[PDB]
Amino acid sequence: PIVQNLQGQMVHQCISPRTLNAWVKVVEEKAFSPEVIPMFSALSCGATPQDLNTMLNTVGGHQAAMQMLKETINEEAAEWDRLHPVHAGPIAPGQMREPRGSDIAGTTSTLQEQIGWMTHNPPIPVGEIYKRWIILGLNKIVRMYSPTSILDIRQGPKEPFRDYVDRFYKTLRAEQASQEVKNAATETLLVQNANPDCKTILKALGPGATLEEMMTACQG
Amino acid sequence: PIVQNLQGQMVHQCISPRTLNAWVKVVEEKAFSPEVIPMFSALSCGATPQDLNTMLNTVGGHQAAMQMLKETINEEAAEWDRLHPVHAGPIAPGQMREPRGSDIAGTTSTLQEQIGWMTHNPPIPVGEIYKRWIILGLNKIVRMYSPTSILDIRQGPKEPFRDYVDRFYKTLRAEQASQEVKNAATETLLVQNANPDCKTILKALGPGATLEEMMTACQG
Amino acid sequence: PIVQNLQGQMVHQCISPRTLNAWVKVVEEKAFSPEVIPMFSALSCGATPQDLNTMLNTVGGHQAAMQMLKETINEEAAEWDRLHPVHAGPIAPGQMREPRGSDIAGTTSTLQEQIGWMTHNPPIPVGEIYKRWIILGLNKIVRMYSPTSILDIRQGPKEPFRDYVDRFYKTLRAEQASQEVKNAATETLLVQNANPDCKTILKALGPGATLEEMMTACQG
Amino acid sequence: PIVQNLQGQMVHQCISPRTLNAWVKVVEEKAFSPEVIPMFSALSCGATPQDLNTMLNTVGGHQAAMQMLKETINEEAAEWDRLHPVHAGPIAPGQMREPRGSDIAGTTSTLQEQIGWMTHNPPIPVGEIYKRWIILGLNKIVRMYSPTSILDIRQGPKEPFRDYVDRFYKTLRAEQASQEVKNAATETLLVQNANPDCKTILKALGPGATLEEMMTACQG
Amino acid sequence: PIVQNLQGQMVHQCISPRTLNAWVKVVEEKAFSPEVIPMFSALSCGATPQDLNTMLNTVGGHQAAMQMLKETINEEAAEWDRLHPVHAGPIAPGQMREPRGSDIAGTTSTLQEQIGWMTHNPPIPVGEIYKRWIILGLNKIVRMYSPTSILDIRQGPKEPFRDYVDRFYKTLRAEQASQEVKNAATETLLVQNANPDCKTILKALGPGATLEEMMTACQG
Amino acid sequence: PIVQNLQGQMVHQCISPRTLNAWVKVVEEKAFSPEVIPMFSALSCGATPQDLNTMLNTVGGHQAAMQMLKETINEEAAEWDRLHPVHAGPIAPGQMREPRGSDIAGTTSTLQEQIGWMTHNPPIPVGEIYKRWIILGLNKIVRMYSPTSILDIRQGPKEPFRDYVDRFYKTLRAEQASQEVKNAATETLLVQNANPDCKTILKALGPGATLEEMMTACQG
Numbered sequence A, B, C, D, E, F: 001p002i003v004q005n006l007q008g009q010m011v012h013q014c015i016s017p018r019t020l021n022a023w024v025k026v027v028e029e030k031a032f033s034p035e036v037i038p039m040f041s042a043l044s045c046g047a048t049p050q051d052l053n054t055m056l057n058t059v060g061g062h063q064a065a066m067q068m069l070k071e072t073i074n075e076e077a078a079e080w081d082r083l084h085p086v087h088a089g090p091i092a093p094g095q096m097r098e099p100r101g102s103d104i105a106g107t108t109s110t111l112q113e114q115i116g117w118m119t120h121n122p123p124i125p126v127g128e129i130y131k132r133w134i135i136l137g138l139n140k141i142v143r144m145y146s147p148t149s150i151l152d153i154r155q156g157p158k159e160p161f162r163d164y165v166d167r168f169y170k171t172l173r174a175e176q177a178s179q180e181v182k183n184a185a186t187e188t189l190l191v192q193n194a195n196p197d198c199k200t201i202l203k204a205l206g207p208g209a210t211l212e213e214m215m216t217a218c219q220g
């Protein structure tokens, strides 16, 4: 990663063993459950493209997911290059060349070029751009490896309301879109797919009930 | 988090893998027992709103609770906005715009704006305001997920007084309120719900007995 | 905690995850065995009142003990305030208000006021005063949760002398008082409650025998 | 390793017990699965040749592979020497002699000469040259210890498409080459070795299908 | 402990949770095997007397031994006092009073007086004097809790010579003395207590045989 | 150990708990397998003689090996003293006395004298000299505790060639000598003790076959 020293300079630091192991173990145990994204984002804090490639290369298995990840990265790399055509010319003494999509992904850039970009003034944050592409890719995988659709979450006749809302939002969290799309899913389904007893109770509460009020009203 | 380095400057640091892991593990093992609040408060020491969102996002399961958490956050954010009317105008070169509620919650603010607010002179401590909203929300979840009422905690005819006082205060701590009447639940409900043998001993102790005095008197 | 930076300034540091976990685990495994006090004292090195409250709030269970702890703290807080009546008046530019008992315990003080007190010149060590009150409270709990009295420690007819002295001083360590009180317990009981064979041997050694000499004399 | 301290100077540091342990454990559990290469590359960040030799020497077992590793290192060292002819002559007071192949490999160079090369201006990065030779050697070991060929990876008549793509790319990654024909193995061999049900679906998708599109189309 | 920071100043640091835990665990698993002494000496590197008392106080059980430890400490403290007669007189502004025995042991000295002594110019190293007394006491405990005498360590008729030498020196190390006669126990008692087959071989080796030569000669 | 601070000064640091435990555990689990030497060398990076004595004193068991270690050290100490006769005379204000063999081994030197030697300009590295003696001793123990001779490694009639080369070089690694001696062992035995099928294949390859080529030729 790139961290600040006490001189105020952004300097490269080695990825710690603890960071590597934490990422390997969290994929081992949680696969592509939705909480893998924040874990990956937090563990890759300050990462260079090299660090991000290190983390993704240490994943054992799920190689189909990892290949989808590369295809996502390549599309985002192609989009970056078409929005940032590089301008030919000698790079000046105090400068860095402009990065191409393959440079952000680390396939055509050295770690020293990545450090130069990330510690420049102003910085060109190839690590955070790459991370964006990867997390975009991981979001697709979480959505693809989600077993259940939001339309299939229906409260059982003896199922406690808390357990049902747990399943509802767990399912909703794995199909990532805008929250505009997730507010629409809730307003469309959460009360309508409650069991007949709780549904009649919540209809009387009206559309303005908070979730806390809905869960208290269907308590047992 | 934003911590002071070894020289006295407030710097951004990455959330550590141990901090991430410790918070995930505490929710896994303790759910919303009351001791999750101090663990969350201590593990989020110096957190930015991004750090707090990371921690909350790493929680697997309990998504009904996490949704209640967002609704509490949004209520407090709207209250913040109603108390901090917007002042339109170009932000001056040195300084930073006033934060809205969604900026404190981290949904419309970047990490660099959060660093800018938290390291300002004087600092606008968005991380601690956000943290205060979250703990307010987590306190509701603890209250709601507490199974038993204090009026149902009663000493068995053969149950040692110590175990009953353990159950009593464990319950009182989960059923959260101000000390206005929790102070009230002790000293009279604690005696009223003692078994007849210990209850008879505790009347003889008279008003003003310490809990140590009550526990010594009902040992045998 | 409050630690020294390399500038010579006492600065606040976040309580580490390792410190929190160590305290939670040691209470989980050792309850209120006497070695909980030094573990708590060492783990709370440099603690602010906030850190001490964090540690005690993370304890799961033993809530009867924790309430006795609060009653001890409140008595010590009441004693502090009666010995340190606060003097009204505007606090000067370079100063801190004088702390009340509730400020030392952290119920009416902010972490910033605790930092101001603890890093003042000279420091007013509210953290070490609070710790004193807490450890005073923990000593009462260790003494209350001790199963055996010193008068019941009697050497068995086939019990090795080392095992008996182990039990004797383990029991003596849980009833904390002055060592004047613990030297008196030893001189009164250790030889007199040895089994008849070892007792006759140790009577001949005389009152001036070291424990090492007594244990060699009753070896087997 | 040679890392930058908190002030900006390149200093030698001892390899940490966690780094040593992490590398030993990764070889123990993963042998020469492909993910051992990124683990070795990341754990050897900033390594001197002495550090790299230490890491390789801590490997227990797999001594046939480790001997192949030495033979690869020696071939690269001889290639280095043929490209860097020796210049005889007294080394000047300030500077350091040119490294031979055996010096990069650490067999004829001391740790202080390795520090001298790596902290020179400009640096001669013997640790990264050595690391590049080792990973070249470890890549051969992975290729050799890969049990299955990509031509033998075929989808079963009832095997889900996802599991087959997992096996396909896991295998392709172990059978190491350039993307010249690994790019080639995908998109046609991946389809050719699908079972007849999915194969029929994938012809209808036509050329240019993403892996996400192929995996969505053969879900059911 | 009192350690040097990154700038060259001697500063007080809190004993780490790992150091506390490591010492507790070592006593739990190894009791008073000889290797507890180096573990205690290394884990108490730079300790103040308060740190040493903390470590000793965290020991659960073995209270008979811990009481022997106090008696040894008190004997050494009295010897220290008899060699360092008190000089009455007001302590000058810059300097510190001379330490008594109880101050080195930490029973009549505060942590700040211990820091003052240890960081003085020249330093009065009360922590190392205290440590020396404790290890003297722990050495007595190891000697006393060693079950077997060196005269009872003898090679079985079918026991491999290596295992017997292992038992021999393991025992010799627990039965602690100076090398005046431990040097003596080897080379003649080691041969005398060998079984007749190996004993006959070792006479033929003659005086001056190394232990490697003896162990090679009694392999078969 | 002796580490560099940020002032450029070599300063003493306490041996970490993690370093102590790592060395104890690696001996516990791996005994004197050959990888114990690099683990010991890496874990004792920067060690003082005191640290090296600490590490070796913490080893439980294998006391016969540890005594052979002392005899090796004493021979190397005797050789050092006969090559470095100390010259009598007052030590100057800015100087350190010359170290004897017993000073390098730490039996007649204080930790402060070891720090003085190791941080002198130029340094006299008693820690690295001692380490050399110890590792010389550990090499003898690895060679003594090796069960199998190189002449007994013969490929089985159904044994895969990789497994046989594994055993061959594992055995060869435990009998440490020069690689001149280990190249001679390979050229003498590796092909000649292959099973009759693989032997005839490798004879045709000729003496110039790499190990990688030999292992591919005897694949199955």
Ligand SMILES: CC(C)(C#Cc1ccc(-c2ccc(Cl)c3c(NS(C)(=O)=O)nn(CC(F)(F)F)c23)c([C@H](Cc2cc(F)cc(F)c2)NC(=O)Cn2nc(C(F)(F)F)c3c2C(F)(F)[C@@H]2C[C@H]32)n1)S(C)(=O)=O
Residues within 6 Å of the ligand: A037, A038, A041, A135, A169, A170, A172, A173, A174, A179, A182, B053, B054, B056, B057, B059, B063, B064, B066, B067, B068, B069, B070, B071, B073, B074, B105, B106, B107
């Ligand atoms: C960097 C990174 C780690 C990030 C970020 C990141 C950034 C912002 C926000 C956020 C913060 C505050 C509010 Cl008030 C809202 C909001 N209020 S609103 C308009 O009503 O929805 N929305 N947001 C998302 C925003 F801003 F993106 F829109 C937020 C989050 C929340 C943090 C959070 C998690 C939590 F558990 C509980 C909380 F109280 C807050 N995380 C999510 O909300 C994820 N989530 N998804 C869904 C579902 F799909 F089911 F609906 C559900 C959640 C849920 F909250 F967990 C809960 C069960 C419901 N995280 S990264 C690149 O890896 O992602």
Ligand SMILES: CC(C)(C#Cc1ccc(-c2ccc(Cl)c3c(NS(C)(=O)=O)nn(CC(F)(F)F)c23)c([C@H](Cc2cc(F)cc(F)c2)NC(=O)Cn2nc(C(F)(F)F)c3c2C(F)(F)[C@@H]2C[C@H]32)n1)S(C)(=O)=O
Residues within 6 Å of the ligand: B037, B038, B039, B041, B042, B169, B170, B171, B172, B173, B174, B179, B182, C050, C051, C053, C054, C055, C056, C057, C058, C059, C063, C064, C066, C067, C069, C070, C071, C073, C074, C105, C106, C107
């Ligand atoms: C979360 C966070 C931000 C915080 C804080 C925070 C802030 C202040 C205080 C506090 C400190 C000292 C006193 Cl004397 C009192 C007091 N004395 S009084 C006039 O009698 O009420 N009150 N308080 C709360 C105050 F100030 F809020 F009012 C306190 C606490 C205590 C700390 C504490 C915990 C403990 F175990 C034992 C202690 F001795 C002290 N924690 C609680 O008290 C929680 N608790 N709740 C109840 C119940 F509900 F059952 F009654 C019960 C407890 C209990 F003590 F554990 C015990 C069984 C009874 N914590 S953080 C930094 O931890 O992350």
Ligand SMILES: CC(C)(C#Cc1ccc(-c2ccc(Cl)c3c(NS(C)(=O)=O)nn(CC(F)(F)F)c23)c([C@H](Cc2cc(F)cc(F)c2)NC(=O)Cn2nc(C(F)(F)F)c3c2C(F)(F)[C@@H]2C[C@H]32)n1)S(C)(=O)=O
Residues within 6 Å of the ligand: C037, C038, C041, C135, C169, C170, C172, C173, C174, C179, C182, E053, E054, E056, E057, E059, E063, E064, E066, E067, E068, E069, E070, E071, E073, E074, E105, E106, E107
């Ligand atoms: C900060 C903190 C961690 C502290 C402190 C703290 C401060 C000082 C001292 C101390 C130091 C040296 C001596 Cl010589 C005496 C002494 N010599 S004397 C006049 O003969 O008794 N007395 N003391 C206590 C003093 F000073 F307080 F009086 C001491 C201790 C000892 C440290 C110690 C522990 C140990 F195991 C073995 C040792 F050699 C020394 N710890 C105790 O002694 C606790 N203990 N209690 C009893 C019993 F009840 F059974 F008798 C028993 C012990 C015992 F020693 F373990 C042993 C079985 C007997 N600790 S804190 C706030 O959390 O407490």
Ligand SMILES: CC(C)(C#Cc1ccc(-c2ccc(Cl)c3c(NS(C)(=O)=O)nn(CC(F)(F)F)c23)c([C@H](Cc2cc(F)cc(F)c2)NC(=O)Cn2nc(C(F)(F)F)c3c2C(F)(F)[C@@H]2C[C@H]32)n1)S(C)(=O)=O
Residues within 6 Å of the ligand: A050, A051, A053, A054, A055, A056, A057, A058, A059, A063, A064, A066, A067, A069, A070, A071, A073, A074, A105, A106, A107, D037, D038, D039, D041, D042, D169, D170, D171, D172, D173, D174, D179, D182
């Ligand atoms: C060892 C080290 C020094 C390094 C490096 C290193 C350097 C660059 C790159 C890389 C980055 C981005 C893209 Cl877009 C491509 C690309 N896009 S492309 C035009 O389609 O080929 N190619 N590359 C390799 C490049 F640049 F070398 F060509 C890359 C990688 C990727 C990192 C990565 C891993 C991952 F899991 C998922 C990702 F999204 C990205 N790792 C690999 O690709 C390894 N891999 N191999 C194969 C196979 F053989 F099966 F095909 C397969 C993978 C796979 F991706 F895992 C997946 C199943 C398929 N690593 S380090 C720092 O880790 O220690």
Ligand SMILES: CC(C)(C#Cc1ccc(-c2ccc(Cl)c3c(NS(C)(=O)=O)nn(CC(F)(F)F)c23)c([C@H](Cc2cc(F)cc(F)c2)NC(=O)Cn2nc(C(F)(F)F)c3c2C(F)(F)[C@@H]2C[C@H]32)n1)S(C)(=O)=O
Residues within 6 Å of the ligand: E037, E038, E039, E041, E042, E169, E170, E171, E172, E173, E174, E179, E182, F050, F051, F053, F054, F055, F056, F057, F058, F059, F063, F064, F066, F067, F069, F070, F071, F073, F074, F105, F106, F107
């Ligand atoms: C506690 C502490 C403060 C200290 C120190 C401390 C100080 C010095 C020395 C030492 C160093 C080198 C030599 Cl050559 C000799 C020597 N050579 S000699 C002329 O033959 O006697 N003697 N010494 C002790 C000296 F100096 F004190 F005399 C030493 C030791 C050795 C270190 C060591 C341990 C080891 F395993 C193997 C080694 F090669 C060296 N440790 C011991 O020797 C302990 N030991 N005891 C006996 C027994 F009793 F059975 F005989 C046995 C050992 C044994 F070696 F393990 C082995 C089975 C035999 N430690 S600390 C820093 O660790 O925390």
Ligand SMILES: CC(C)(C#Cc1ccc(-c2ccc(Cl)c3c(NS(C)(=O)=O)nn(CC(F)(F)F)c23)c([C@H](Cc2cc(F)cc(F)c2)NC(=O)Cn2nc(C(F)(F)F)c3c2C(F)(F)[C@@H]2C[C@H]32)n1)S(C)(=O)=O
Residues within 6 Å of the ligand: D053, D054, D056, D057, D059, D063, D064, D066, D067, D068, D069, D070, D071, D073, D074, D105, D106, D107, F037, F038, F041, F135, F169, F170, F172, F173, F174, F179, F182
């Ligand atoms: C500081 C310390 C930690 C050190 C060092 C240290 C110093 C240098 C070297 C070394 C480096 C590069 C080359 Cl190219 C050769 C070489 N090339 S050559 C002329 O053809 O043999 N030789 N060397 C040893 C040299 F220089 F000493 F001669 C080397 C090693 C290698 C490092 C290494 C280990 C490894 F696993 C795989 C590698 F590719 C490289 N370690 C060994 O080789 C140990 N080993 N022993 C034998 C056997 F006996 F079976 F043959 C076998 C090995 C083996 F390699 F593992 C493998 C199965 C064969 N380590 S310390 C004081 O604790 O030792």
Ligand SMILES: [Cl-]
Residues within 6 Å of the ligand: A016, A017, A018, A019, D018
């Ligand atoms: Cl780490």
Ligand SMILES: [Cl-]
Residues within 6 Å of the ligand: A049, A050, A053, A105, A106, A107, A109
């Ligand atoms: Cl890269």
Ligand SMILES: [Cl-]
Residues within 6 Å of the ligand: A059, A060, A061, A063, D034, D035, D170, D173
């Ligand atoms: Cl894989």
Ligand SMILES: [Cl-]
Residues within 6 Å of the ligand: A034, A035, A170, A173, B059, B060, B061, B063
């Ligand atoms: Cl989820």
Ligand SMILES: [Cl-]
Residues within 6 Å of the ligand: A162, A215, A216, A219, B144
């Ligand atoms: Cl509910």
Ligand SMILES: [Cl-]
Residues within 6 Å of the ligand: A018, B016, B017, B018, B019
């Ligand atoms: Cl960490």
Ligand SMILES: [Cl-]
Residues within 6 Å of the ligand: B049, B050, B051, B053, B105, B106, B107, B109, B111
């Ligand atoms: Cl955010």
Ligand SMILES: [Cl-]
Residues within 6 Å of the ligand: B162, B215, B216, B219, C144, C145
């Ligand atoms: Cl009780």
Ligand SMILES: [Cl-]
Residues within 6 Å of the ligand: B018, C016, C017, C018, C019
């Ligand atoms: Cl930590």
Ligand SMILES: [Cl-]
Residues within 6 Å of the ligand: C049, C050, C053, C105, C106, C107, C109
């Ligand atoms: Cl507080």
